[PDB]
Design a protein around this motif. Structure first.
Motif, mmCIF file in Angstrom:
data_model
loop_
_atom_site.group_PDB
_atom_site.id
_atom_site.type_symbol
_atom_site.label_atom_id
_atom_site.label_comp_id
_atom_site.label_asym_id
_atom_site.label_seq_id
_atom_site.Cartn_x
_atom_site.Cartn_y
_atom_site.Cartn_z
ATOM 1 N N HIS B 57 -6.535 -18.766 16.982
ATOM 2 C CA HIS B 57 -7.541 -17.790 17.381
ATOM 3 C C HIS B 57 -8.174 -17.141 16.151
ATOM 4 N N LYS B 58 -9.387 -16.648 16.341
ATOM 5 C CA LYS B 58 -10.169 -16.006 15.301
ATOM 6 C C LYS B 58 -9.659 -14.594 15.033
ATOM 7 N N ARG B 59 -9.753 -14.157 13.775
ATOM 8 C CA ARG B 59 -9.228 -12.856 13.379
ATOM 9 C C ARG B 59 -10.172 -12.140 12.433
ATOM 10 N N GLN B 60 -10.190 -10.816 12.527
ATOM 11 C CA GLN B 60 -10.861 -9.960 11.561
ATOM 12 C C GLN B 60 -9.811 -9.204 10.769
ATOM 13 N N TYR B 61 -10.077 -8.988 9.498
ATOM 14 C CA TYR B 61 -9.115 -8.346 8.620
ATOM 15 C C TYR B 61 -9.276 -6.831 8.637
ATOM 16 N N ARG B 62 -8.175 -6.130 8.871
ATOM 17 C CA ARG B 62 -8.117 -4.680 8.746
ATOM 18 C C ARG B 62 -7.638 -4.308 7.346
ATOM 19 N N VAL B 63 -8.320 -3.371 6.700
ATOM 20 C CA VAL B 63 -7.914 -2.918 5.373
ATOM 21 C C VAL B 63 -6.844 -1.844 5.501
ATOM 22 N N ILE B 64 -5.731 -2.044 4.820
ATOM 23 C CA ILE B 64 -4.604 -1.125 4.843
ATOM 24 C C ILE B 64 -4.536 -0.404 3.511
ATOM 25 N N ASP B 65 -3.974 0.806 3.533
ATOM 26 C CA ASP B 65 -3.662 1.568 2.324
ATOM 27 C C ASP B 65 -2.219 1.308 1.940
ATOM 28 N N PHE B 66 -2.023 0.395 1.011
ATOM 29 C CA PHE B 66 -0.703 0.150 0.479
ATOM 30 C C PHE B 66 -0.421 0.993 -0.756
ATOM 31 N N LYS B 67 -1.405 1.751 -1.238
ATOM 32 C CA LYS B 67 -1.289 2.555 -2.447
ATOM 33 C C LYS B 67 -0.845 3.985 -2.174
ATOM 34 N N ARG B 68 -1.492 4.668 -1.231
ATOM 35 C CA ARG B 68 -1.159 6.045 -0.869
ATOM 36 C C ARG B 68 -1.329 6.987 -2.065
ATOM 37 N N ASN B 69 -2.596 7.197 -2.421
ATOM 38 C CA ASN B 69 -2.991 7.905 -3.629
ATOM 39 C C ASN B 69 -3.693 9.236 -3.396
ATOM 40 N N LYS B 70 -3.950 9.635 -2.154
ATOM 41 C CA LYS B 70 -4.712 10.852 -1.874
ATOM 42 C C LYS B 70 -3.751 12.014 -1.664
ATOM 43 N N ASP B 71 -3.535 12.818 -2.698
ATOM 44 C CA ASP B 71 -2.505 13.842 -2.649
ATOM 45 C C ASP B 71 -3.055 15.205 -2.247
ATOM 46 N N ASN B 72 -2.148 16.043 -1.734
ATOM 47 C CA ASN B 72 -2.402 17.455 -1.445
ATOM 48 C C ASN B 72 -3.518 17.652 -0.415
ATOM 49 N N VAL B 73 -3.687 16.683 0.478
ATOM 50 C CA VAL B 73 -4.630 16.733 1.593
ATOM 51 C C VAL B 73 -3.921 16.086 2.773
ATOM 52 N N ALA B 74 -3.730 16.832 3.853
ATOM 53 C CA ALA B 74 -3.036 16.289 5.008
ATOM 54 C C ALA B 74 -3.928 15.324 5.783
ATOM 55 N N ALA B 75 -3.283 14.427 6.525
ATOM 56 C CA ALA B 75 -3.959 13.451 7.368
ATOM 57 C C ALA B 75 -3.330 13.457 8.754
ATOM 58 N N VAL B 76 -4.162 13.453 9.787
ATOM 59 C CA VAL B 76 -3.696 13.484 11.167
ATOM 60 C C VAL B 76 -3.726 12.072 11.729
ATOM 61 N N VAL B 77 -2.804 11.786 12.643
ATOM 62 C CA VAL B 77 -2.634 10.460 13.228
ATOM 63 C C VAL B 77 -3.354 10.405 14.565
ATOM 64 N N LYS B 78 -4.266 9.448 14.710
ATOM 65 C CA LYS B 78 -5.152 9.367 15.862
ATOM 66 C C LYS B 78 -4.814 8.248 16.833
ATOM 67 N N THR B 79 -4.379 7.086 16.345
ATOM 68 C CA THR B 79 -4.162 5.915 17.183
ATOM 69 C C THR B 79 -3.032 5.086 16.599
ATOM 70 N N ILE B 80 -2.377 4.317 17.464
ATOM 71 C CA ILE B 80 -1.439 3.264 17.081
ATOM 72 C C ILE B 80 -1.969 1.971 17.671
ATOM 73 N N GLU B 81 -2.172 0.954 16.832
ATOM 74 C CA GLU B 81 -3.022 -0.164 17.214
ATOM 75 C C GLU B 81 -2.349 -1.507 16.956
ATOM 76 N N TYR B 82 -3.034 -2.568 17.376
ATOM 77 C CA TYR B 82 -2.570 -3.939 17.241
ATOM 78 C C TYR B 82 -3.192 -4.565 16.004
ATOM 79 N N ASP B 83 -2.371 -5.139 15.146
ATOM 80 C CA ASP B 83 -2.910 -5.925 14.054
ATOM 81 C C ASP B 83 -2.593 -7.393 14.268
ATOM 82 N N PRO B 84 -3.598 -8.266 14.239
ATOM 83 C CA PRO B 84 -3.352 -9.714 14.291
ATOM 84 C C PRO B 84 -2.794 -10.330 13.021
ATOM 85 N N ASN B 85 -2.814 -9.631 11.897
ATOM 86 C CA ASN B 85 -2.502 -10.248 10.623
ATOM 87 C C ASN B 85 -1.079 -10.005 10.168
#
Lengths: 88, 275
Positions: B57-85
RNA sequence: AAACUGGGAGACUUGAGUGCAGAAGAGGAGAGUGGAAUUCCAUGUGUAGCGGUGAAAUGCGUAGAUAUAUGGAGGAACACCAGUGGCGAAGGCGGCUCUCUGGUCUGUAACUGACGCUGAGGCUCGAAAGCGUGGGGAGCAAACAGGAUUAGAUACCCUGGUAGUCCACGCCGUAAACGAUGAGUGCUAAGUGUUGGAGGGUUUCCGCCCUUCAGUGCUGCAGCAAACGCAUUAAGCACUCCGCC
RNA sequence: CCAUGUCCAGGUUGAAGGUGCGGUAAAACGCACUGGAGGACCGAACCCACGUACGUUGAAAAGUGCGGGGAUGAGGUGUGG
RNA sequence: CUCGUUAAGGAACUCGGCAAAAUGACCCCGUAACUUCGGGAGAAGGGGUGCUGACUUCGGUCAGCCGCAGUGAAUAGGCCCAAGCGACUGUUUAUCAAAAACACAGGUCUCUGCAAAAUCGUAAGAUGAAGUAUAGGGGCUGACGCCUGCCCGGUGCUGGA
């Protein structure tokens, strides 16, 4: 399991005259509160077989008192079992 | 949970599947997808360098943050999703500046948490820190091996590592598979274990479903001819008429070790345990 | 005809439950934690044995064993307290702290007003071994290997050693599961220990004397038994219901 | 094998889930209605090639006639690679 | 050669019922062993079917009529009882072999800590993979059920000093 303030809270509304802790209305209402709380505890701790014995004995006691109330006054029986929400 | 099918056809008898109950939406963020191609195992030159791959089946690539470099700024969690990759699930995250990002979903992430990503962050699931600042005995995933490059190590569904001890400029980790190792104390990791972990118990059930995943079938060396395999030829069914069964290219196949004997990382490996 | 059993209208408080005031406890479920020892690992010192038996041998050891000192890793069981002691319907339950929860006993005399007992068929629980899925695995140990003994030894004895013994979730449903003594209720001499309460006296009684409830043991009378024996915790004198020969 | 298009007359069956009723202390559970799963079923186009007769200086350097299998898939096939 | 019919018999034919003949639509009644509880199942075995009139609650039912025959032509499952092999749908020798062969979901052993192992290439560069041990390569076995004994002398593999 209910506290001693819940208990008096619910025997002050199924009394008939004052000073009325007997009177099968009071007893089946307080037993109903107990059986509900114990059903909660069993759902959480479902391998507590030693507390399930007490649950079952409470159920037997309530069913017996219901039989008595019915065999002597059907009006009080119907009015109760409407008020308390059972008789599936 | 794992879903079990009733045996209404012969291709259905012993199949199971995922319930997909941690997934909360089915429509991904538009500004984070790129195309892909399905190389199907072929090279620069157009040649098969890896057998048994292609055509699902055909797939589109989702870009992930494997670095985690944005400090001292909180982030809220909006969705939990399916990755084909990959085999883990994925989380869409809103920073407060309004940058969006995807992240690997650890075990026990709820929609609504607020994650922090520096040295003064707390020890909570989701938070990412430098290895210097993580105590001894915390379960960890998504580990950097070089400063500023991105987590590489503990990334698949239901995996985890653990912190064992510190020394001069190195931290001792016990990885998945049980190998013990040293990693620079200035690298990052995130607190928790990876999430979707029933994934291991799925039974694929029929030959078409693994064709939907991009796998082509595999022929055994011993029903080939002597010009295709060392195992081919002979009248009838035959035994392995050799010592040590081999690959199509020679190279023994039971117990024979193939890593580099002058590896520049044999300084850092304590206690090889499983390979 | 109207005493008894059944039916109808009432009335009562002793059986049975409830309220109020107190007591004891390895009763159960979940989550953490402690020290003693056995095994393995690491390091120092250290020289030829150690281990084992009725006697020996197999085994481990000069790639430095055993011993000895310090540090780590993991698992399982909880010394003294500990007792014909306690708790549970039975099977069973013993390190410590917290959370959730069942039952019993004692005093009182607010209350209800016979609401009680037993229970074919049905459901629930039920030691150890065993079975399934996935973990864990130090010590012990069916099967199995090696050494002995004997006329022989597919045993007892010695050196090893796999399932299993441990956790989560399902299944199994049996034991000399025993007090080889079904459950409820009333009545019938005494003497003496111990566990948990309540009253009176003398009163530092809070250590002593007397009475009284409920457990748990010993001795012993009427009566019973084929003898052994049992005996207010009956296998005695009696009524109700079930199981069985 | 890759990228991008397109094709599959008509009919059958009745998985999960859901709603209402009963059975309970709460439940396992039972029955109707709903629902539309699947290398599901029957059968044309389409793709195949199991039996047999003919043909064998052929209508044809591999076919025809009469019967056969699959037909929502591990499917068919156009264009550019 | 391609077609149609045939007394009486009905597989006596032949390596073998090969080839033919027979069944075939819709509606109703019924339907066994076994089982992975879905199936087996169109199991098997039987009945109805045209035309006119009346009523038609509605869907049909009653009365009558005609022929040897009413799905009056064309089109459309033969079935049953047993045993071996392969679980199954699928794939294969274009042009003498379609199968018990290949594949398959499931099992198990082993390699690989990421500039991964493996493969293309003199190299640069690539696939693996914009993956990271619940992942990727290699060997054997081949749904599911119950199970999978003894041997480490030899040869490979691993560890040793």
């Amino acid at each position: 399991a209910i506290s001693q303030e819940r208990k008096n809270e619910i025997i002050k509304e199924y009394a008939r005259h004052e000073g009325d802790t007997g009177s099968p209305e009071v007893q089946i209402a307080v037993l109903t509160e107990d059986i509900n709380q114990l059903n909660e505890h069993a759902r959480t701790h479902k391998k507590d077989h030693h507390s399930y014995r007490g649950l079952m004995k409470k159920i037997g006691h309530r069913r017996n008192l219901l039989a008595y109330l019915r065999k002597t006054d059907i009006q009080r029986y119907r009015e109760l079992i409407q008020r308390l929400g059972l008789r599936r | 949970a794992i879903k079990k099918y009733k045996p209404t056809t012969n291709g259905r008898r012993n199949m199971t599947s995922s319930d997909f109950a941690e997934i909360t939406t089915s429509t991904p963020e538009k500004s984070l997808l790129q195309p892909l191609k399905n190389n199907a195992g072929r090279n620069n030159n157009g040649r098969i360098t890896v057998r048994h791959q292609g055509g699902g089946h055909k797939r589109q690539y989702r870009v992930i943050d494997f670095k985690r470099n944005k400090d001292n700024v909180a982030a809220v969690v909006k969705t939990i999703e399916y990755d084909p990759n990959r085999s883990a699930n994925i989380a869409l995250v809103h920073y407060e500046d309004g940058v969006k990002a995807y992240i690997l979903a650890p075990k026990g992430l709820e929609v609504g948490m607020r994650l922090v990503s520096g040295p003064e962050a707390d020890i909570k699931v989701g938070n990412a820190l430098p290895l210097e600042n993580i105590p001894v005995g915390t379960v960890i995933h998504n580990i950097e091996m070089k400063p500023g490059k991105g987590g590489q190590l503990i990334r698949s569904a239901g995996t985890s590592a653990q912190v064992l001890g510190k020394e001069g400029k190195y931290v001792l980790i016990r990885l998945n598979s049980g190998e013990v190792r040293m990693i620079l104390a200035t690298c990052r990791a995130t607190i928790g274990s990876v999430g979707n972990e029933q994934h291991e118990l799925i039974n694929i059930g029929k030959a078409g479903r693994s064709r939907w995943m991009r796998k082509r079938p595999t022929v055994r060396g011993s029903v080939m001819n002597p010009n295709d395999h060392p195992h081919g030829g002979g009248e009838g069914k035959t035994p392995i008429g050799r010592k040590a069964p081999v690959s199509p290219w020679g190279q023994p196949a039971i117990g024979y070790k193939t890593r580099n004997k002058k590896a520049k990382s044999d300084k850092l490996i304590v206690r090889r345990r499983t390979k």
